[PDB]
Amino acid sequence: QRFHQASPEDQAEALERYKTIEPYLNGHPPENETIPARTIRHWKAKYLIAIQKYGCGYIGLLSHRSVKG
DNA sequence: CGTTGCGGCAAAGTTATGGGTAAAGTCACACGTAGTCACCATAATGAAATAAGATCACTACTGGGCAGTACCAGACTCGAACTGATG
Numbered sequence: 001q002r003f004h005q006a007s008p009e010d011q012a013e014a015l016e017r018y019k020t021i022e023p024y025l026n027g028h029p030p031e032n033e034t035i036p037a038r039t040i041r042h043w044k045a046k047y048l049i050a051i052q053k054y055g056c057g058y059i060g061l062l063s064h065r066s067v068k069g
Numbered sequence: 070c071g072t073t074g075c076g077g078c079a080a081a082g083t084t085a086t087g088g089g090t091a092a093a094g095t096c097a098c099a100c101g102t103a104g105t106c107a108c109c110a111t112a113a114t115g116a117a118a119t120a121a122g123a124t125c126a127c128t129a130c131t132g133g134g135c136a137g138t139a140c141c142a143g144a145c146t147c148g149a150a151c152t153g154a155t156g
């Protein structure tokens with residue numbers, strides 16, 4: 001249902017978060033990372049939280065901007 | 070002890086949504102929208118006609134009475150005559 005709540009822009013943002021975190025999930029972190037460490041750590045923590053209590057961790061990277069306003 | 074990664078906290082950053090205000094657009098005023106067959110049931114006469122009714126004319130059948138005739142007496146009336154009392 002969270003996936004059904006996502007937008008193509010939210011999908012692209014989740015894709016960007018996944019591409020940012022993916023080097024940190026393989027033991028080969030990049031030496032040139034513009035995104036600060038706190039956001040990377042939060043994304044990784046939510047990845048693990050989703051893969052623990054949901055079943056798949058990508059679903060923990062969904063923004064769902066539509067509720068805001 | 071120092072370093073490194075991780076996580077909480079609270080501004081800060083980004084979208085979104087319902088308000089206000091000047092300013093670029095937008096569009097009608099230019100004589101004009103109402104207007105016209107098609108439609109089939111009901112009243113409604115006026116004519117067409119009725120189906121029975123009304124009367125004429127003829128044919129046949131069957132009740133049935135009127136002007137006139139006729140007899141057998143009974144009964145009242147009266148010519149004609151008889152006969153007795155009388156002044």
